[PDB]
Design a protein around this ligand. Structure first.
Ligand SMILES: [K+]
Ligand code: NA
Ligand code: NA
Ligand code: NA
Ligand code: NA
Length: 162
């Protein structure tokens, strides 16, 4: 199954492309959900949504494509799907992990780590890593703030598989 890309704008200016390799062999349903949400048309997935919460030296969070503020989103399976396993750990920057509201509540929201976050191990499912565009991840992280409210709008202007 192919890698996933997001094209990113910051303050409505193109900032480049992030490409992710997903760990389908280990968390196939978690990988499948993020890949189909990336392929979907605007309004039905990541295309046209924002990184609504960004905290430097911690992570960039996105995937709320229904409310744009952290209260929304839904997986391709419905509102919530299970934690498949916690075999992969938050061992390095640039990992994709699911946000949730406790055990077995994954939806569409995810975050990309920018530091080692090993205190999340066993509570958030890691399912992929950035393989191109850590430069772009840096630039998005630079508009984060103490409150997590981005100081410039960061949009996924296109997404799909490459
Ligand atoms: K798309
Ligand atoms: Na933008
Ligand atoms: Na989409
Ligand atoms: Na979002
Ligand atoms: Na790169």
């Amino acid at each position: 199954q192919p890698n996933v890309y997001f094209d990113i704008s910051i303050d409505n200016q193109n900032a480049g492309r992030i490409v992710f390799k997903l760990y389908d062999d280990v968390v196939p349903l978690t990988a499948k959900n993020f890949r189909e949400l990336a392929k979907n048309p605007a309004g039905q997935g990541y295309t046209g949504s924002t990184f609504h919460r960004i905290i430097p030296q911690f992570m960039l969070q996105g995937g709320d494509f229904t409310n744009h503020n952290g209260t929304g989103g839904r997986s391709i399976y419905g509102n919530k799907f299970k934690d498949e396993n916690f075999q992969l750990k938050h061992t390095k920057p640039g990992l994709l992990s699911m946000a949730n509201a406790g055990p077995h509540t994954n939806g569409s929201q995810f975050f990309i780590t920018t530091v080692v976050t090993s205190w999340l191990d066993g509570k958030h499912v890691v399912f992929g890593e950035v393989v191109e565009g850590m430069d772009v991840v840096k630039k998005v992280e630079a508009v984060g703030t103490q409150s997590g409210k981005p100081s410039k709008v960061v949009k996924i202007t296109a997404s799909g598989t490459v």
